[PDB]
UniProtKB/Swiss-Prot annotation:
One of its GO terms (cellular component) is host cell cytoplasm. This is Head-tail connector protein FII. One of its GO terms (biological process) is virion assembly. It is found in: Virion; Host cytoplasm. SUPFAM superfamilies: Phage tail proteins. Keywords: Host cytoplasm, Late protein, Viral capsid assembly, Viral release from host cell, Virion. Plays a role in virion assembly by joining the head and the tail at the last step of morphogenesis. Six FII proteins probably bind protein W that closes the DNA-filled capsid, as well as the U tail terminator protein of the pre-assembled tail. May bind head-to-tail joining protein W and protein U.
Length: 117
């Protein structure tokens, strides 16, 4: 469970806080215009509780995606993307002048995800 970690983790961090938080998400943008851009970022669901007591939310209705550059911004509506499972969709909005740095996604985690083992 714990091996090959420099040396220790008590009198070296001089902090001891904020450890959990595994990351490493890959998302790919494929639009009818210029499909061929791989971005990093994961899915976020405000609602949180997506198990029981659903069909209303009254708190979380749409999930956002966290990006680390400025490509998702270009991910204008009507663009399909693939992440991990290989399914990400731009839920963003643009009544006329699109360009919001909110990044609201719509997922459709399907079976086919190019597995290898």
């Amino acid at each position: 469970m714990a091996d090959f970690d420099n040396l220790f983790d008590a009198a070296i961090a001089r902090a001891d806080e904020t450890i959990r938080g595994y990351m490493g998400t890959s998302a790919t943008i494929t639009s009818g215009e210029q499909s061929g851009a791989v971005i990093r970022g994961v899915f976020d669901d405000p609602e949180n509780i997506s198990y029981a007591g659903q069909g209303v939310r009254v708190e979380g209705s749409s999930p956002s995606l966290f990006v680390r550059t400025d490509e998702v911004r270009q991910l204008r509506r009507g663009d399909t993307l693939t992440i991990g499972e290989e399914n990400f969709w731009v839920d963003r909005v643009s009544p006329d002048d699109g360009g919001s740095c909110h990044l609201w996604l719509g997922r459709g985690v399907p079976p086919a995800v190019n597995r290898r083992r």
